[PDB]
């Protein structure tokens, strides 16, 4: 990515509704960590990058 894509984040999403999740670390064009979830309906949504809850949703996707 060539700039920051996430402005606001949300926290209220059931893992059952998430198809995939992208964890983007700080880079040369973005001084923010960003977490983008693609929902089962196809919508892309920015999530709060708090390490425990992001790892909860990540582990549940990263397995079952």
């Amino acid at each position, epitope marked *: 990515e*060539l*700039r*920051c*894509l*996430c*402005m*606001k*984040t*949300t926290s209220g999403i059931h893992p059952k509704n998430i198809q995939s999740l992208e964890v983007i670390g700080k880079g040369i*064009h*973005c*001084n*923010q960590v*960003e977490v*983008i979830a693609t929902l089962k309906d196809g*919508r*892309k*949504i*920015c999530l709060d990058p708090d390490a425990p809850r992001i790892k909860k949703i990540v582990q549940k996707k990263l397995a079952g």
Partner: antibody
Amino acid sequence: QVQLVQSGAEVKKPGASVKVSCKASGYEFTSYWIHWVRQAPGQGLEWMGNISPNSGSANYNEKFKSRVTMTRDTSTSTVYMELSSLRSEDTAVYYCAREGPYSYYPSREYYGSDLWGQGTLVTVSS
Amino acid sequence: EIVLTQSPATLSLSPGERATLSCRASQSISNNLHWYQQKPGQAPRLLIYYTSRSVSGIPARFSGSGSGTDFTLTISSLEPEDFAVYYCGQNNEWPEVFGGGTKVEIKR
């Protein structure tokens, strides 16, 4: 009233530092990026960097990275730009501009900067 | 990084005439190209965003278009207030980049 109100004109000696403020009013502060754009006399526009009023995260132009700091104050809805080790080439009008409104939906389609401050003239001289 | 090249540097026309301003990008910037107007003593003002999208408070006579790395700003009929400097600006990637500007002057 929807506006970006900048602090007054500044005179600084070479090697000194300047801190310019930009106060937002009449809109949702956390929903728009705040860019710092400068215009040297009779010249075009140059982006210095930006700051998210939501996260407080600043992104800088590599050209200025070594001597610029952008910060934000949620309590007053104010963003600041500090430029240090000032030189003649830093004499310009400094603008703040908002880009948004953005939500929690990521995008690769962007808005322009629809609202600009009045500008702050910064004169660097011995 | 991105280099935005505007042409011509000066456009000399009469009020009521049609104005066509050009912007060329060094690389692709998707459709994230925006148009600004600046008058002497004033801050830049957004006219068109995302290549061709309309801006709140801006008159109908301003429109934009652009395929790939070539972009265009059209003023269908110049008003006396339209003789000013126009910039193209990209925000597809940071750092944001502006063109060198095009001055639109009254022909005489």
